[PDB]
């Protein structure tokens, strides 16, 4: 009949085709009302601190500094080395190094064994 548009990582469901909009339980409107109350408090605080003629400076959002502190400074203190983290670190830390080392190594032996036997064409190669 109609194509079912599947959810994807790069293609989220729309705000209109989601069945979660169209449920009529009471805690849905209670949660929406409390979210609106929180947003109204934050917007009221921003407008009172933002329309002030006396204030000349940056409105210091705690969320921005909180996110920038959580991005870098709060990685090690809540890190515990387990199987997953150590496995991922060993996979992404020494894997590509070994791969590039072996590729460049065998390229070096091939080039050297070509150039000692004179098979490599170096007729005009005088700048190195």
């Amino acid at each position: 009949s109609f194509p079912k548009y599947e959810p994807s990582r790069l293609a989220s469901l729309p705000t209109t085709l989601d069945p979660a909009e169209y449920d009529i339980s009471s805690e849905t409107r209670k949660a929406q009302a409390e979210r609106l109350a929180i947003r109204s408090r934050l917007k009221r605080e921003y407008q009172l601190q933002y329309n002030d003629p006396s204030r000349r400076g940056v409105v210091e959002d705690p969320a921005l500094i909180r996110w920038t502190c959580a991005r870098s400074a709060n990685v090690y203190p809540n890190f515990r080395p387990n199987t997953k983290t150590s496995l991922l670190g060993a996979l992404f830390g020494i894997g590509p190094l070994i791969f590039w080392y072996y590729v460049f190594k065998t390229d070096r032996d091939r080039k050297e064994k070509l150039i000692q036997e004179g098979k490599l064409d170096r007729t005009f190669n005088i700048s190195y």
Binding site: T68, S72, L97, W100, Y101, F104, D107
Partner: protein
């Protein structure tokens, strides 16, 4: 070299005997006189270095670094003369004295004929930067920035000094005018392997090498900007001077040993370019870009071809100037907005047009726009690394995409878009700031016309 050391040690009482409101003017004027005087070092010949005396010499290699150093001091003095207006006068003179002592130790570092003298003042340079970083910073982490910066570098070189002393017991002299003729080949053994490691790891830390680069971003996001410019622009070049003075003695064992160092440098410069692609602070982004540039310089001197040496010296000088002026940009932004977040202050081209022009010129010179000296050095290193092996160009090519991708993006979110509404303290351009920015930018363009003065010791 007594005609530049004595001016520095005689300017030391001048900044100690100056008045309470004329310290900056007198120091800037006399440092600019020393900067003009320093041009006499270019009396260079195609065969012999300008050997001044027994313990002082300066070939075609160290002279651009010296000129950069005592041109860099007045720029640091202008860039650090705003926030120290409320600081006490005695501590202001202490800060200026620390900068003067750092310049003196740097000029004595690049012209030391004996390698022991070079080492001794190369980490006599460690005390003033540590003092400035720990005292005149602006965050708590500066205390941690005094540890990771110190206990890395010394841990690389306390072996190295022993190795240097061993050469004093082996060759009989560590002089560089002698060791160019008394050098013996290095055999393949474990003892020579550890001697190579000890002679390499100190400046590998000081570049920094990837894996050992953790001291660079932690010591840049908090420094006073005089410290940030001296660290990014000239203090990282001590590793390059260590390479081009030490690698003579470490042949031919360097050729079949430096494979993991080159692998680490290439894949770590890829990693740090990717980390620049996902940063939130200006200072950390510039520091990681500096890590990528020094990894490229590491590969350039490790492959040891003449074209690579030309490219390494040109890239070193150009990256020093570009990183110093980028840190000046970031300091102006942090001065105006009192934060280091990239996404906070956006769309400044609508409010500040000349800083937008300097941002554009900085971003253009960062991604090696021809015919700038950055492109000259980067291109020479590219061709030398293609001569080392073919597949390396692939490991270059992605980087040359990524080193553009952030270099404009770091501009764009800071300059283009809708400006932040709740920020209103954006002052217009102070003449001091733009004068500093132009003094950074104009030599970088001028050196493109006559590159032969900064093309290493073998041009």
């Amino acid at each position: 070299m007594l005609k530049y050391i004595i001016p520095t040690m005689m300017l030391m009482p001048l900044t100690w005997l100056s008045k309470n409101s004329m310290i900056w003017i007198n120091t800037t004027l006399h440092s600019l006189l020393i900067s003009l005087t320093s041009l006499l070092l270019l009396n260079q010949f195609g065969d012999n270095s300008l050997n001044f005396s027994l313990t002082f010499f300066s070939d075609s290699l160290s002279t651009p670094l010296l000129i950069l150093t005592m041109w860099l001091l007045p720029l640091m003095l202008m860039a650090s003369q705003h926030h120290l207006s409320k600081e006490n006068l005695a501590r202001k003179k202490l800060f200026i004295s620390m900068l003067i002592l750092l310049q003196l130790f740097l000029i004595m570092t690049f012209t030391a004929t004996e390698l022991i003298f070079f080492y001794i003042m190369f980490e006599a340079t460690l005390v003033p930067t540590l003092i400035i970083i720990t005292r005149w910073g602006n965050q708590t982490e500066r205390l941690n920035a005094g540890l990771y910066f110190l206990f890395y570098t010394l841990a690389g070189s306390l072996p190295l000094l022993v190795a240097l002393i061993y050469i004093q017991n082996t060759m009989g002299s560590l002089n560089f005018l002698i060791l160019q003729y008394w050098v013996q080949p290095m055999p393949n053994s474990w003892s020579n392997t550890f001697m190579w490691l000890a002679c390499m790891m100190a400046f590998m830390v000081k570049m920094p090498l990837y894996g050992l680069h953790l001291w660079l971003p932690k010591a840049h996001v908090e420094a006073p900007i005089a410290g940030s410019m001296v660290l990014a622009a000239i203090l990282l070049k001590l590793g390059g001077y260590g390479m081009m003075r030490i690698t003579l003695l470490l042949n031919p064992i360097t050729d079949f040993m430096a494979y993991p160092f080159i692998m680490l440098s290439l894949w770590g410069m890829i990693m740090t370019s990717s980390i620049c692609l996902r940063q939130t602070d200006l200072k950390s982004l510039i520091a990681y870009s500096s890590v990528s540039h020094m990894a490229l310089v590491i590969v350039a001197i490790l492959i040891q071809t003449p074209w690579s040496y030309m490219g390494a010296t040109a890239l070193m000088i150009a990256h020093g100037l570009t990183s110093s002026m980028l840190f000046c940009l970031a300091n102006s932004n942090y001065e105006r907005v009192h934060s280091r977040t990239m996404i906070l202050a956006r769309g400044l081209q609508t409010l500040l047009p000349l800083m937008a022009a300097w941002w554009l010129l900085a971003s253009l010179t960062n991604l090696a726009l021809p015919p700038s000296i950055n492109l000259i050095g980067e291109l020479f290193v590219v061709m030398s690394t293609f001569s080392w092996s073919n597949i390396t160009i692939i490991l270059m090519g992605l980087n040359m995409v990524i080193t553009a991708l952030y270099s404009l993006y770091m501009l764009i979110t800071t300059q283009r878009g809708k400006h932040t509404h709740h920020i209103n303290n954006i002052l217009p351009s102070f003449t001091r700031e733009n004068a500093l920015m132009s003094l950074h930018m104009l030599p970088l363009l001028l050196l493109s016309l006559n590159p032969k003065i900064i093309l290493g010791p073998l041009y």
